Amino acid sequence: AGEHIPIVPVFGEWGFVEDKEVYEGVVRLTKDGQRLRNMIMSFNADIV
Amino acid sequence: MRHNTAKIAVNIAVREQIEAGVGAWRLVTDYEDQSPTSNNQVIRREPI
Protein backbone atom coordinates (compact mmCIF):
# COMPACT_ATOMS: atom_id res chain seq x y z
CA ALA A 1 0.00 0.00 0.00
CA GLY A 2 2.89 2.38 0.83
CA GLU A 3 4.56 4.65 -1.72
CA HIS A 4 7.62 4.67 0.55
CA ILE A 5 9.37 1.85 2.40
CA PRO A 6 7.44 1.00 5.65
CA ILE A 7 10.68 0.01 7.42
CA VAL A 8 12.79 2.87 8.72
CA PRO A 9 15.85 1.48 10.63
CA VAL A 10 17.35 3.37 13.59
CA PHE A 11 21.13 3.50 13.99
CA GLY A 12 22.75 4.63 17.25
CA GLU A 13 26.20 5.18 15.76
CA TRP A 14 26.41 5.28 12.01
CA GLY A 15 28.84 6.11 9.24
CA PHE A 16 30.77 5.15 6.14
CA VAL A 17 34.52 4.60 6.45
CA GLU A 18 34.85 3.72 2.74
CA ASP A 19 31.23 3.63 1.55
CA LYS A 20 30.61 0.32 3.21
CA GLU A 21 28.23 0.94 6.09
CA VAL A 22 29.70 0.43 9.56
CA TYR A 23 27.68 0.95 12.72
CA GLU A 24 27.76 0.04 16.37
CA GLY A 25 25.97 0.39 19.67
CA VAL A 26 28.23 0.73 22.70
CA VAL A 27 29.11 -2.90 23.55
CA ARG A 28 31.56 -3.38 20.64
CA LEU A 29 34.84 -2.59 22.39
CA THR A 30 33.74 -3.65 25.90
CA LYS A 31 34.42 -7.26 24.80
CA ASP A 32 38.19 -7.01 25.14
CA GLY A 33 38.63 -5.62 28.65
CA GLN A 34 35.77 -7.57 30.22
CA ARG A 35 37.17 -10.97 29.28
CA LEU A 36 40.62 -9.76 30.44
CA ARG A 37 39.21 -8.93 33.91
CA ASN A 38 37.46 -12.31 34.10
CA MET A 39 40.72 -14.08 33.16
CA ILE A 40 42.66 -12.46 36.04
CA MET A 41 39.75 -13.19 38.38
CA SER A 42 39.81 -16.90 37.56
CA PHE A 43 43.61 -17.26 37.81
CA ASN A 44 43.72 -16.34 41.48
CA ALA A 45 40.35 -17.97 42.30
CA ASP A 46 41.96 -21.34 41.48
CA ILE A 47 44.88 -20.54 43.83
CA VAL A 48 42.48 -19.60 46.67
CA MET B 1 13.85 19.80 2.92
CA ARG B 2 10.84 18.08 4.58
CA HIS B 3 12.42 14.75 3.58
CA ASN B 4 14.83 13.39 6.19
CA THR B 5 17.60 12.85 3.57
CA ALA B 6 18.51 16.52 4.19
CA LYS B 7 18.88 16.03 7.96
CA ILE B 8 21.24 13.04 7.45
CA ALA B 9 23.68 15.37 5.67
CA VAL B 10 23.66 17.76 8.67
CA ASN B 11 24.55 14.91 11.07
CA ILE B 12 27.43 13.77 8.79
CA ALA B 13 28.74 17.35 8.57
CA VAL B 14 29.25 17.94 12.30
CA ARG B 15 30.39 14.38 13.11
CA GLU B 16 33.05 13.81 10.46
CA GLN B 17 34.43 17.34 10.90
CA ILE B 18 35.52 16.40 14.42
CA GLU B 19 36.66 12.86 13.58
CA ALA B 20 38.17 12.79 10.08
CA GLY B 21 38.71 16.54 9.74
CA VAL B 22 36.34 16.82 6.72
CA GLY B 23 32.67 16.31 5.92
CA ALA B 24 30.66 17.12 2.79
CA TRP B 25 27.12 17.60 1.52
CA ARG B 26 25.63 18.51 -1.87
CA LEU B 27 22.62 20.38 -3.21
CA VAL B 28 21.02 18.84 -6.30
CA THR B 29 17.86 19.55 -8.30
CA ASP B 30 15.44 16.84 -9.38
CA TYR B 31 11.78 16.31 -10.27
CA GLU B 32 9.57 15.37 -7.33
CA ASP B 33 5.96 16.12 -6.42
CA GLN B 34 5.99 14.45 -3.01
CA SER B 35 7.07 17.79 -1.53
CA PRO B 36 6.38 20.11 -4.48
CA THR B 37 7.61 23.69 -4.84
CA SER B 38 7.14 26.13 -7.76
CA ASN B 39 7.40 25.01 -11.41
CA ASN B 40 7.27 21.39 -10.08
CA GLN B 41 11.04 21.51 -9.45
CA VAL B 42 12.53 20.93 -6.01
CA ILE B 43 16.01 21.34 -4.56
CA ARG B 44 17.18 18.55 -2.27
CA ARG B 45 20.18 18.26 0.03
CA GLU B 46 21.79 14.85 -0.40
CA PRO B 47 24.38 13.27 1.94
CA ILE B 48 28.02 12.70 1.01
What backbone phi and psi angles, to 5 degrees, belong to B44?
-120, 150
How many angstroms away from the CA of B42 is the closest CA of chain A?
18
Q: Which residues contact B42 (CB under 8 A, 6 or more apart)?
A: B29, B30, B31, B32, B35, B36
C-alpha dihedral sign at A25, B2, B42, A4: positive
Under a CB-based contact definition with an 8 Å cutoff, are residues B16 and B22 in contact? Answer: yes
Resolution attained, angstroms: 10.5
Q: Which residues contact B39 (CB under 8 A, 6 or more apart)?
A: none
Q: What whole-number distance in Å separates Cα of residue B16 and Cα of residue A15?
A: 9
How many CB pairs below 8 Å do chains A and B form together?
4
Under a CB-based contact definition with an 8 Å cutoff, are residues B30 and B46 in contact? Answer: no
Q: What whole-number distance in Å separates Cα of residue A13 and Cα of residue A2?
A: 28
